[PDB]
Swiss-Prot record:
One of its GO terms (cellular component) is myelin sheath. It comes from Homo sapiens. The record marks 89 as: Involved in the binding of some activators, including histamine and L-histidine. Changing residue 196 to H: Higher affinity for bicarbonate. Enhanced proton transfer capacity. It comes from the Eukaryota. Changing residue 116 to E: Strongly reduced activity. Its EC number is 4.2.1.1, 4.2.1.69. It catalyses: hydrogencarbonate + H(+) = CO2 + H2O; urea = cyanamide + H2O. The lineage of its organism: Eukaryota, Metazoa, Chordata, Craniata, Vertebrata. This is Carbonic anhydrase 2. GO terms for molecular function: arylesterase activity; carbonate dehydratase activity; cyanamide hydratase activity; zinc ion binding. Changing residue 195 to S/V: Reduced activity. It is an enzyme of class 4 (lyase).
Amino acid sequence: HWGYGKHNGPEHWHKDFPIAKGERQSPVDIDTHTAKYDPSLKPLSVSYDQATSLRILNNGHSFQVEFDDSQDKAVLKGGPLDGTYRLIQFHFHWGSLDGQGSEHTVDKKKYAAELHLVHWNTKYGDFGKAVQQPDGLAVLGIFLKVGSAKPGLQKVVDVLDSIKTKGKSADFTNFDPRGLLPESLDYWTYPGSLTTPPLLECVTWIVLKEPISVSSEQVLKFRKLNFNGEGEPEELMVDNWRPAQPLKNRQIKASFK
Ligand SMILES: CCc1cc2c(cc1OS(N)(=O)=O)CC[C@@H]1[C@@H]2CC[C@]2(C)C(=O)CC[C@@H]12
Ligand SMILES: CCc1cc2c(cc1OS(N)(=O)=O)CC[C@@H]1[C@@H]2CC[C@]2(C)C(=O)CC[C@@H]12
Ligand SMILES: [Zn+2]
């Protein structure tokens, strides 16, 4: 099955998933000089006050914190988006070294990690139907750099010991994702895809310009997770990022001058 190794990594994915070579694949390099300010972009609205987390899961590629999305609680609206998108989960991508790990890049710069807050367009009724639509998902991407600790991340870091291996989960209630957000909501936006198989072209990407800082110890704990299941040979969960893909016939728009 697909993964991030030499024999099953991103350069192999197109064999099982030919859309890997499609017209709106993600991630991309954000060329800041070529991105254009768009006055038509409505204000961006991140409303997470009623977010209800449930569980944290090692999914074999990364780890994810899942939310109760059976009601309109935590939602993303505005910006480039038409309608309302509901938060279902967040997860991260990260490196084996601080100098790599992000999926998007900014003028070719790679960050240590990238947080993805995944939301689905409520007009499609549930997540599985939404991923079949060109405007089905909105993913808010946030870069992580290594510096000061992010206090709001520590509760996540400390439960990772309980989900070391693939398929392990743990209860994870009352976690507030507002503690993972930078000060500014200035962003770049473009139409793209999921960055793992099945690589569906269903995502409006909204990538924040301002990174959050996390500590070396916090990201080190990400790197102690395992891709493997319990009782299997240990494979450290690191470098679970897809590299930048061709921009093709797309323009990246900026929310800011
Ligand atoms: C990989 C594409 C895909 C993923 C998913 C579903 C359906 C999918 O499309 S498809 N075509 O049915 O396979 C349904 C459940 C989803 C799961 C992703 C992780 C989710 C969102 C959570 O965190 C909790 C609910 C989980
Ligand atoms: C649907 C959003 C999305 C979900 C997921 C990933 C990437 C995503 O796209 S992105 N990076 O936000 O564009 C990476 C790993 C995925 C995880 C969902 C649960 C999965 C499918 C499993 O159970 C095994 C693999 C797990
Ligand atoms: Zn992701």
